[PDB]
């Protein structure tokens, strides 16, 4: 059933690992490869994406910062401490979420367009996170096992 | 196969004792219209060349020099389609009226359907049936195998209880017995079928061929005679390790280069770690010297070389294995580029 | 006569159950379940049948006769049985079930693949209108199942949706309105596509490691690892009794065969691994 | 009684027309019910023609034309070169047999003389694909037989032996 | 007319001699054949049709008592049918159509007609998609220790069918037929089982093309032996001669007689008919008369489905 | 009879206990608990076992014999054992508990659900045919307990609404304030429905991040760093310990088995994890 979520990966990550640089939240992102897994199964995806969109530098900057890779390159993500180096993360997640047709992309590009639809949008996903959890832990795992090995 | 089959009538009735030699003799008398068959058909395939086809009247010709690809191509096409019918050896054999009415000879048990099938050979009916293990000589004496006490031990050395065997099955045990018999074959048209039972029976050599049991048992011998002494000390009784009695030798390289280093390596291991009634004894010995107990496994290594057929057909699928299928020279045309790059390099 | 009468029965395990099978397969157990032809964990004739013969002729000493005669012969083993096992088939495997809907409380539920069903029919039709024995409900049960294949059917439910063994989500649907179960265990049947169906089943099964400890240092010992595959507990086994015509097979269905709800099937049973319930497809 | 049509399916998509009018005739012999193509039918000693599609014969049971038996007459501007014969259908040798024999056959078989001309190189060649072969669903599946996908659910499978049962050996020149 | 042998579990139609803990140092093991001979077909089927006061010699004579010519045992999976194919050690399922152009496949050329018949074994051949041989690995054990017996170890290469395979024969009374429909059998070696349903057909029978498929073990008579192995390419074009035993008859528990026989899935070349038929005596031919109402030598050839006895 | 002896006992965990899993499968811990087939923890009978005759072969070093029969020889076996040791079902984890309206207010009580209790009524009536042990006590008060599937209860206590583990509101009802305790022990049972009681007995679990420190620079060395699942002290398994006539399954069921109060089980002992106390039902009814 899952076996194309490890070639979803590549060109989804796209870069969480050489643009990511200078080593503190570089290194850091193995902290939510791991954590984050032992976060969303123990606690609930809900709870974990609450502390992760709180993380979140959402003004237009971590809106972009992401936005901008769904369509042209790899996107050194230095800005400041983990918020563009957890928007891509936030990035990472939906990006799973729009290739796979759980949310698509007309809401999703629409839900963080005018923060009248985040709310909804999220208040979205918490009906979803039971099938979101279940369906993204081989995907998750996936880069938690590449970032022991090469991250 | 005839002078071999008489030859070894004649070298076990040289041996009227010792048992197993005298049952030789007397099913091989029983069986000779049902081994005059040889167990191993051939065929064979020629093809013809002339003058017609080398020269042009005084001298050689121009495609001349192709005329044996041509004709080791025809032989080998012969060969394979010859080899589309397979027919087996047992199929020659004339056996309706012998298992239909009986009249297969049982020397040893009786089965109680029919006749048996061989143990060794799986088709073949059997003429030599062994009891099971559970009380021999008072069978074995009853019935035909053996005369006395003394020759069931040399019986027993050979077919083991329970083994059934046909003719050619059993002959091949009496060749696995002492197997100098192979001279009658090996040397032929130089030697009297006569000569060479003489020169067995005058210079008697008995040969250990190994079973699977020795091969599986190889590091566990190794590691006994790296304990000579040390080891036996705690036997000391068993003959694991006694003397070399006699001089016997083998073709078996390890067992070769390895029989005078204090343990006797004729031992069975199915008698003594491989048995139901000891091993236990055995794995308490092996325990107490650091002696990693056996595993019952070994190795059956095959290998046959790639495409060697083709190669001396001087065909490519040798140079490019998988690349260019057998399949692919019906019409080679469609391959030109790979069998003129290589063709070309060579 | 020749097969007259047929008994089938239901394979309840009630520890898990490991029926070894040597190293027979191509995955990375190293002591595998017996398999099917479908790389489904099947339990032999001949496992089921030894395993009964030896049961029995422990729990029923004086019927030594009645119970040879049915199932063999040590020696003078010329007098064949008069009955004979078919190769238990998985009917429905436990599967844990995080379910988003229906408003009723599920933690596991059962869980089939339409071959699996497929074999059931095949032993159920090759009995009922040949034999005369008669529970053709459970054939026309089976039947009615069978014409939805291709999409995950929920059986006796309200389900719609579930996350099956942690690991995958399906959609489900009713099968018409409503219909007797199956199984009388009160936990609801899902009958999956025959791909999702059998992902869900190689996650029901339980695949341990296992050690020898070195005796003295509470060490591993070198090598001393290796994995083993158990069906899980719960899980459920179909198989038919079939029984030629005789006085004794008689004596069989009637003293014996009546009183056989509990027997030990596989082995590992010091780890437990083999307790079983059979219940008879005759209540 | 009827007549039947034993036309040609090549990798070439000149199977879109063979008979005017959708379906005409009273019955047909070759069915797709369900689990495969059934009765279809293997013509021997032929060859295909992709290009200037019709027959062009090779002699010999190794070479051969794979084709279905429709009810139709051949474009009603033909066959001066489309066999018409007339057998008493048990040496119509028809593969997967399920339906009715009719005893009184009658079959018009797109075909052109061989014409000698090119070293008739004549190489097999499979039916796949996929994007050649899935838009001929309902022009050679549903322009004569609408019978499918109006009880049919079931096309993929009479789809994986559409996959295999079509072969022939074609011209290529 | 015609009778689906339907297995209902993995069979086992033992190809070998002896299967049993003789030896006690050793294993034991055993291989299904793909195609059980007709005997096994006969001899369950007059099992069906038993009679407890007639013969009790030479079985064919009280087994032929019961039944018909039967013709031949072949593969229907779902409606679709498979026919054996030998060649030297090896066998293939190959469908109807796949058959029509061997005859001129053997006379191509030596590589044209390698790579053919070697297309037709490995890539047209559809055992392996729908049989496959299923090791069974069995013990027994002794009721003093709970643990294995001393080496009492067998393997078993049953046969496990990947989708629905039935077993195909024919047979003409229909008195049979109706007194054989739906039973459970005892059809195969160690205790498997298989149902029977019967439904009523047509086939023709009277054909005589060049060559042939043999639906069956032809029996050769003992008396043509000699006269049939130094000539074997007047007779076969390919396929496999094998020394068989004709089964192990149960009234009188007895091995049956051994045969020279042409396994199944071999071609023969039309010269084998008369060939037979020349060359054995009355007496021989009122046994090999009964050796063919039970099916030995059954032909098929390549064009239709085309059933021929030998002798009749 | 089956079996010569049947001995149905408690595990109640004295420290936490990890008992590892053996699986190929990726999991979020690193070194999560044994599973049984609902996903609740479970001990497998070859760890207990292995752990219980471990042990054994050291309290009574002159009944080795006894033991070697009983649970089998180590290195050179030539028989099967005549013990037999069933998976240990869990059967009541110990909660957090805040209440509402007490009288006298607990701080933990005992959770269990109706599957679980469901899987011992299995074990109690499989055995019971096995063998001539009859356990009309405990079968009685689990199948009166077993009425009221699909109602959160407190066996004994008056509770009526509680928040479990600090995260889990439940309703709760009386069995009928006039049944036993299943062990005598001074804290209420809550008998849960299955789908809440999930994750409040998730909840109950213990991860333990733990780490590796460089002895030279007092920081974690690279790598050293894995999370660790236990379950928590006074947590109740159940399982059933059996055996076959052999005249040293006697000495076992009477000698061996009446001296058995305290075992070490899984692993992380080094670090206070396994001691455990044994129950034996016949004497905790
Ligand atoms: N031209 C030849 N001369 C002598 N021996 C041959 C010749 N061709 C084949 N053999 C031997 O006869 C047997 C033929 O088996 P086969 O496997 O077809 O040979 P092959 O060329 O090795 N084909 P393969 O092994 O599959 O690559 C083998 O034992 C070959 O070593
Ligand atoms: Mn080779
Ligand atoms: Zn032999």
Redesign the pocket.
């Known amino acids: 059933l899952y076996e194309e979520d490890y070639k979803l990966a590549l060109e989804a990550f796209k870069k969480v690992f050489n643009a990511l640089t200078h080593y503190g939240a570089k290194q850091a992102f193995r902290s939510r490869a791991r954590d984050l897994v032992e976060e969303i199964y123990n606690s609930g995806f809900i709870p974990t994406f609450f502390y992760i969109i709180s993380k979140a530098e959402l003004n237009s900057d971590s809106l972009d910062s992401l936005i901008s890779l769904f369509s042209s390159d790899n996107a050194i993500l230095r800005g400041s401490d983990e918020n563009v180096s957890y928007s891509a993360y936030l990035f990472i997640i939906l990006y799973y979420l729009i290739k796979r047709g759980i949310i698509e992309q007309k809401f999703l590009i629409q839900a963080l367009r005018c923060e009248k639809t985040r709310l909804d949008l999220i208040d979205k996903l918490y009906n979803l996170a039971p099938i979101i959890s279940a369906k993204i832990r081989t995907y998750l795992l996936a880069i938690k096992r590449l970032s022991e090995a090469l991250i | 196969w005839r002078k071999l089959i008489e030859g070894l009538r004649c070298y076990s009735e040289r041996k009227r004792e010792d048992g197993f030699w005298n049952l030789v003799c007397r099913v091989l008398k029983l069986t000779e219209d049902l081994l005059q068959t040889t167990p191993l058909n051939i065929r064979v395939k020629q093809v013809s060349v002339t003058e017609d086809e080398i020269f042009n009247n005084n001298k050689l010709r121009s495609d001349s020099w192709k005329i044996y690809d041509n004709k080791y191509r025809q032989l080998?096409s012969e060969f394979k389609k010859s080899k589309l019918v397979k027919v087996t050896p047992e199929s020659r054999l004339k056996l309706f009226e012998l298992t239909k009415f009986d009249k297969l000879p049982q020397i040893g048990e009786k089965s109680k359907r029919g006749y048996e099938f061989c143990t060794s050979c799986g088709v073949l009916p059997a003429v030599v049936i062994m009891p099971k293990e559970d009380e021999l000589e008072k069978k074995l004496i009853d019935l035909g195998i053996a005369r006395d006490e003394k020759d069931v031990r040399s019986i027993k050395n050979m077919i083991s209880p329970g083994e059934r065997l046909c003719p050619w099955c059993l002959v091949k045990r009496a060749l696995g017995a002492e197997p100098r018999l192979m001279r009658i074959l090996l040397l032929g048209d130089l030697y009297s079928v006569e000569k060479i039972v003489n020169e067995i029976v005058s210079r008697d050599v008995k040969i250990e061929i190994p079973s699977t049991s020795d091969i599986a048992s190889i590091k566990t011998f190794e590691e006994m005679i790296e304990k000579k002494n040390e080891i036996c000390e705690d036997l000391k009784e068993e003959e694991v390790c006694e003397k070399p009695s006699e001089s016997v030798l083998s073709m078996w390289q390890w067992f070769n280069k390895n029989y005078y280093n204090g343990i006797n390596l004729t031992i069975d291991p199915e008698e003594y770690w491989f048995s139901e009634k000891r091993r236990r004894y055995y794995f308490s010995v092996f325990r107490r010297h650091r002696i990693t107990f056996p595993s019952p496994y070994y190795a059956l290594v095959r290998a046959?070389?790639?495409?060697?057929?083709?190669?001396?057909?001087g065909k490519l699928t040798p140079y490019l294995a998988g690349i260019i299928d057998s399949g692919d020279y019906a019409n080679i045309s469609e391959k030109k580029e790979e069998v003129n790059k290589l063709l070309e390099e060579y | 006569p020749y097969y007259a009468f047929a008994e089938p029965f239901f394979i309840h395990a009630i520890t898990h159950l490991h029926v070894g099978s040597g190293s027979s397969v191509e995955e990375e157990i190293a002591l595998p379940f017996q398999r099917d032809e479908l790389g489904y964990p099947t339990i032999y004739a001949s496992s089921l049948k030894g395993a009964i013969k030896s049961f029995l002729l422990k729990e029923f000493p004086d019927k030594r006769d009645v119970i040879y005669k049915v199932l063999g012969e040590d020696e003078n083993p010329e007098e064949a049985s008069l009955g004979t096992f078919l190769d238990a088939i998985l009917f429905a495997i436990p599967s844990r079930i995080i379910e988003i809907d229906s408003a009723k409380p599920y933690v596991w539920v059962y869980v089939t693949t339409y071959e699996l069903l497929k074999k059931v029919k095949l032993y159920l039709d090759s009995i009922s209108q040949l034999s005369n024995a008669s529970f053709s409900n459970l054939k026309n049960k089976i039947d009615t199942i069978l014409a939805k294949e291709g999409k995950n059917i929920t059986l006796d439910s309200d389900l719609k949706s579930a996350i099956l063994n942690e690991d995958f989500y399906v959609e489900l649907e009713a099968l018409n309105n409503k219909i007797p179960s199956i199984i009388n265990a009160g936990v609801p049947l899902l009958v999956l596509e025959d791909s999702i169906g059998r992902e869900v089943i190689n996650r029901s099964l339980i695949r341990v490691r296992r050690i020898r400890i070195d005796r003295d240092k509470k060490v591993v010992e070198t090598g001393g690892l290796w994995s083993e595959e158990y069906v899980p507990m719960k899980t459920i086994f179909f198989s038919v009794l079939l029984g030629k015509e005789s006085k004794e097979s008689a004596i069989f269905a009637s003293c014996i065969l009546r009183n056989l709800r509990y027997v030990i099937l596989g082995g590992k049973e010091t780890i437990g691994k083999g307790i079983v319930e059979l219940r008879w497809v005759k209540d | 009684s009827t007549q039947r049509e034993y036309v040609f399916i090549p990798i070439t998509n000149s199977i879109t027309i063979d008979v005017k009018i959708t379906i005409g005739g009273s019955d047909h012999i070759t069915n797709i019910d369900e689990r495969g193509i059934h009765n279809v039918l293997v013509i021997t000693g032929y060859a295909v023609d992709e290009k200037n599609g019709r027959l062009v014969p090779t002699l010999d049971p190794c070479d051969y034309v794979k084709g279905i038996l429709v009810a139709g007459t051949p474009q009603q501007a033909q066959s001066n070169d489309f066999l018409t014969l007339k057998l008493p259908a048990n040496k119509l040798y028809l593969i997967r047999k399920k339906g009715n024999i009719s005893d009184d056959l009658k079959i018009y078989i797109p075909y052109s003389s061989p014409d000698a001309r090119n070293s008739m190189k004549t190489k097999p060649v499979s039916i796949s694909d996929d994007t050649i072969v899935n838009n001929i669903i309902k022009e050679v599946f549903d322009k004569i037989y609408n019978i499918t996908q109006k009880e049919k659910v079931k096309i993929e499978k009479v789809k994986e032996d559409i996959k295999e049962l079509f072969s022939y050996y074609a011209l290529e020149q | 007319k015609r009778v689906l042998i339907k297995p209902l579990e993995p069979l086992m139609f033992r190809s070998q001699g002896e299967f049993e803990p003789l030896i006690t140092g050793s294993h034991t093991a055993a291989q299904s054949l793909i195609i059980p001979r007709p005997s096994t077909i006969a001899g369950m089927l007059g099992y069906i049709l038993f009679n407890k006061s007639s013969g009790t010699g030479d079985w064919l004579s009280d087994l032929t008592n019961l039944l018909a010519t039967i013709y031949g045992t072949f593969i229907e999976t779902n409606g679709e049918y498979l026919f054996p194919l030998r060649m030297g050690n090896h066998l293939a399922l190959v469908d109807q159509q796949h058959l029509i152009n061997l005859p001129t496949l053997l006379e191509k050329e030596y590589e044209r007609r390698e790579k053919g018949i070697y297309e037709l074994f490995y890539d047209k051949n559809k055992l392996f998609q729908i049989i496959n041989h299923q090791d069974r690995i069995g013990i027994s054990i002794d009721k003093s220790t709970r643990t294995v017996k001393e080496h009492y170890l067998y393997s078993a290469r049953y046969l496990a069918f990947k989708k629905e395979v039935n077993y195909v024969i024919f047979i003409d009374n229909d008195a049979i037929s109706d007194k054989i429909n739906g039973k459970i059998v005892n059809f195969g070696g160690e205790n498997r089982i298989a149902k029977l349903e019967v439904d009523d057909y047509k086939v023709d029978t009277s054909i005589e093309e060049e060559y042939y498929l043999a639906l069956s073990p032809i029996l050769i008579p003992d008396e043509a032996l000699d006269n049939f192995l130094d000539n074997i390419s007047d007779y076969v074009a390919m396929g496999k001669v094998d020394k068989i035993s004709l089964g192990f008859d149960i009234a009188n528990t007895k091995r049956k007689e051994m045969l020279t026989a042409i396994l199944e899935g071999s071609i023969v070349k039309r010269s084998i008919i008369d060939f037979i038929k020349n060359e054995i005596k009355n007496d021989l031919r009122y046994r090999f008369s009964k050796y063919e109402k039970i099916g030995y030598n059954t032909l098929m050839s390549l064009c239709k489905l085309a059933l021929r006895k030998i002798l009749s």
């Open positions: 080998v046959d070389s790639d495409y060697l057929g083709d190669l001396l057909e």
